[PDB]
RNA sequence: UGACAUUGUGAAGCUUUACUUAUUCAAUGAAGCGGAGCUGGAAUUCCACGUUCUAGCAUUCAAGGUCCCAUUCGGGGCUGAUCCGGGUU
RNA sequence: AUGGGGAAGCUCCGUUUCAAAGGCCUGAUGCAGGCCACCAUCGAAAGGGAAUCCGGUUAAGAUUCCGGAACCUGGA
């Protein structure tokens, strides 16, 4: 106390050299990074076609972990698991010579773009989950219609890496289910009727509604300055 | 939870974890002999008027030697060949193209001795 | 007909700059934050030559804001500036000679050198021995300002580009005649190989396209088109008038 | 020579002062003499500046 | 499968999204490398179609050149 | 020089004006941009929001303050240096 | 050259720029850990440049050898 002073740095433009501050806003970031986060701005700014702003609305934070629960009890075989499973039927098949009905009826959720598709146009789909952020839009663009069409109910999901934790992959873009238990149809139900009502039931108005137009900050701090000032004029 | 602070706005490149070779087989099957081993370096004497001279009064050798070799080389080919230590190595390159090295040992060894002990007077 | 002097001139060669000398580029500080929203001071430590330059060379001391080190700027030094003068670069400063102010921050008639042509670079306007450019006025609607260049020209630029206050000094340069070739032939040695030039009616007729002919005469008519190619452009390019002006022709 | 200045002891290539073999003693003198004089200006501006800001 | 729904709609290059998506696309083509290795197919279909497997060893360039 | 393509989004009446994301120009080691908030002055509005006799000095994640663990002889957080948006301008 | 960008292409522009571009001090390949942000390289036997002189010596060597006497650099 008697030695050590107070002497408050003077920080002003002239004044003694600036001290380390947070630069993170001005990181001259690598050129991936950079076409990184200008793809997501540029494809925000322009006007997003109704076919693709669609993909906007998920479910909430509630209806996907009820539908991730759901799915869980029928996240399909591991290789392990399917290996004890061959074991079991070797066993069968020279013991008891049966190989049909010698292992119980798997129950799994389908998955894979072009089994889920098929099976939304057969109609044996009793429901189906979309991952939201494939990297070709194009391969599940159409899948939201083809479903309205088919008269299946479709979720737009949140994250193709959640899929692919259910599925023992490490992406997936679509998870369907096709033949659900009795146990479980009671919870099928009730993720229906809710599932459909924020996305099915919606599909005809989100038809009609474009999106995209959100400027930056900097854009809509002027504009709204702008229309201040000019709507009282 | 909030991003990495940066007292910087030029990002580097960030220093990765780097591995050591280990290859599957050996680059070579056999590792090389030694390529210039005393009995390479140190080729033959020369022994010419002025040589003998050197050798006679200066306490100096002359000997021919490959070009590949140097004067750590030489003193060192000497000193195993002929159990002689060397004082100094001067070596030059002859216009017939290879290397004269005047290797002068201590003053305790005898030039005239150690010439008629590898055999040429 | 062989590629004229003219032409041969914007391949490089022999024709570029005598560069070794100069003390290098003369540049105002960089638009940074200290300067463009208050001033920083620097100290003139020593005015130099610059060869192949008629303006004599101010070198400013300025201290680093975000380091310690000692940025060093090359200006062009104005009639007034001595060694030891403090130069205040910015927004805030106030005006006297040598100071370098945003071109909105100063008032009618003013007096400027080394003007910013866009705010941003390092000076583009004014910078020969002598020369200078006059504030016309302002227009903060639309953040610019109105300016007379040397050449007599009116031109209009954003309000915050800088501009040192002064003249370039090294004035009336020209007003002295060089007596001998030798002094010319000294003036260009240090510039960019401009000299000495042969007439092209002097030229043979490849050569050049007033060359040829039994008497020295250019032949055609020496106002040459605009739209003329490169290679037919000797003489009087995109000539409105020619002749002796007789006449007030403004001042 | 530049490179004899290595070879040689610190006292001929020094002098016993602040910026001994740097500055000369009439410069050194006269940069204590700025220092001292435009410190105490700059306490003394202080407080002409403390003591007109209470007159509001 | 997937792959007449993609076939079909691809042969829509006027379409809004597929206009929209075109508009992102080259603008991302533009900012990399005139040569850059794409990590999967734009199309896969295409892809499927001119003889592309997703498989190890299958290589998928990406190329831009100077038109006129 | 004109048309077609990149080339998109709006208004007001062929015309004018508007928007940033395409594209174009420039600079920096992408350092302080935009919005908001204090603090005083003028007066809800606007302004500034640490530096001008002098050829000195200005660096150690900053001293102080405060809160922890260890206090060790040390280490750590916040503040000092307002908050939010990561659009470098 | 590289990063890049042109060019059908042999190659061209470019030399620090539209780049995720590294080596220095350690106490021990992280590192205690820190440091720095410069920018491949080539380019002079007349430019800059660490330090050697005398006497003697050969058929022909020499500030190089011999005798003597010094200095520089690196490192223990």
Same mark, same amino acid.
């Given at each position: ?38 793809? &997501? ?23 996907? $972990? ?30 008891? &010579? ?11 959720? &389908? ?13 044996? $789909?009793?429901?189906?989950?979309? $991952? ?57 139900? &009730? ?41 009282? $004029? | ?13 960030? @220093? ?59 003193? @060192?080919?000497? @000193? ?42 | ?251 | ?56 | ?68």
């Amino acid at each position: 106390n008697p030695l050590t002073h107070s002497t408050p740095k003077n920080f002003g433009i002239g004044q003694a050299v600036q001290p380390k501050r947070n630069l993170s806003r001005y990181v001259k970031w690598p050129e991936y990074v950079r076409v990184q986060r200008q793809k &997501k701005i540029l494809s925000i700014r322009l006007k997003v076609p109704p076919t693709i702003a669609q993909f906007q609305y998920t479910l909430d934070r509630n209806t996907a $972990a009820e539908t991730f629960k759901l799915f869980n009890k029928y996240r399909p075989e591991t290789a392990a698991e399917k290996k004890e499973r061959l074991t079991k039927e070797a066993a069968a098949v020279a013991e008891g &010579k049966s190989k049909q009905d010698a292992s119980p009826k798997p129950y799994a959720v &389908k998955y894979g773009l072009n089994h889920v598709v098929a099976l939304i146009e057969n109609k044996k $789909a009793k429901l189906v989950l979309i $991952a939201n952020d494939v990297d070709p839009i194009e391969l599940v663009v159409f899948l939201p219609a083809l479903c309205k069409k088919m008269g299946v109910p479709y979720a737009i999901v949140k994250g193709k890496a959640r899929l692919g934790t259910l599925v023992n992959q490490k992406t997936s873009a679509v998870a369907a289910l096709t033949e659900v238990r009795a146990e479980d149809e009671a919870a099928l139900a &009730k993720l229906v009727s809710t599932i459909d009502a924020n996305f099915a039931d919606k599909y005809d108005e989100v038809k009609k509604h474009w999106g995209g137009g959100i400027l930056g900050n900097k854009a809509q701090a002027k504009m709204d300055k702008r229309a201040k000032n000019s709507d009282s $004029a | 939870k909030a991003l990495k602070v940066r007292t910087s706005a030029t990002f580097r490149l960030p @220093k990765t974890l780097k591995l050591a070779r280990a290859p599957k087989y050996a680059s070579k099957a056999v590792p090389h002999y030694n390529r210039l081993d005393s009995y390479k370096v140190i080729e033959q004497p020369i022994t010419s008027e002025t040589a003998m001279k050197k050798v006679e009064d200066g306490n100096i050798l002359v000997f021919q030697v490959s070009m590949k070799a140097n004067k750590y080389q030489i003193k @060192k080919a000497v @000193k195993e060949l002929y159990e002689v230590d060397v004082l100094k190595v001067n070596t030059l390159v002859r216009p017939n193209g290879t290397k004269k090295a005047y290797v002068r040992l201590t003053a305790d060894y005898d030039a005239l001795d150690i010439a008629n002990r590898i055999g040429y007077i | 007909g062989r590629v004229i002097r003219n032409q041969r001139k914007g391949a490089g060669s022999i024709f570029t700059s005598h560069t070794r000398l100069r003390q290098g580029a003369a540049k105002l500080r960089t638009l940074d934050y200290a300067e463009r929203h208050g001033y920083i001071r620097g100290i003139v430590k020593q005015i130099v030559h610059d060869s192949g330059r008629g303006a004599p060379l101010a070198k400013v001391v300025f201290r680093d804001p975000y380091k310690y080190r000692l940025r060093e700027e090359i200006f062009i030094a104005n009639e007034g500036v001595h060694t030891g003068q403090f130069i205040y670069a910015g927004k805030k400063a106030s005006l006297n000679v040598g100071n370098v102010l945003p071109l909105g921050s100063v008032p009618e008639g003013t007096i400027v050198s080394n003007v910013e042509e866009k705010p941003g670079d390092r000076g583009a306007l004014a910078r020969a021995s002598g020369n200078y450019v006059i504030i016309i006025g302002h227009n903060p609607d639309e953040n610019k300002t109105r300016v007379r260049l040397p050449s007599g020209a009116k031109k209009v630029i954003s309000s915050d580009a800088r501009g040192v206050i002064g003249v370039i000094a090294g004035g009336g340069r020209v007003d002295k005649p060089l007596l001998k070739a030798g002094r010319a032939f000294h003036k260009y040695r240090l510039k960019r190989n401009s000299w000495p030039k042969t007439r092209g009616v002097a030229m043979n007729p490849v050569d050049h396209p007033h060359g040829g002919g039994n008497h020295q005469h250019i032949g055609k008519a020496s106002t040459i088109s605009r739209g003329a190619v490169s290679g037919q452009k000797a003489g009087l390019i995109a000539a409105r008038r020619t002749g002796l002006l007789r006449g007030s022709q403004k001042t | 020579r530049p490179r004899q200045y290595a070879t040689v002891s610190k006292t001929h290539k020094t002098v016993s002062r602040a910026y001994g073999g740097s500055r000369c003693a009439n410069c050194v003198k006269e940069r204590i003499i700025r220092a001292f004089l435009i410190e105490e200006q700059k306490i003394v501006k202080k407080v002409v500046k403390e003591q007109t800001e209470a007159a509001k | 499968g997937a792959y007449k729904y993609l076939e079909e709609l691809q042969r829509k290059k006027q379409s809004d999204v597929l206009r929209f998506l075109q508009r992102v696309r080259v603008w991302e083509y533009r900012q990399k490398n005139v040569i850059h290795r794409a990590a999967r197919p734009t199309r896969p279909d295409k892809a499927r179609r001119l003889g592309y497997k997703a498989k190890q060893g299958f290589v998928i360039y990406r190329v831009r050149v100077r038109r006129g």
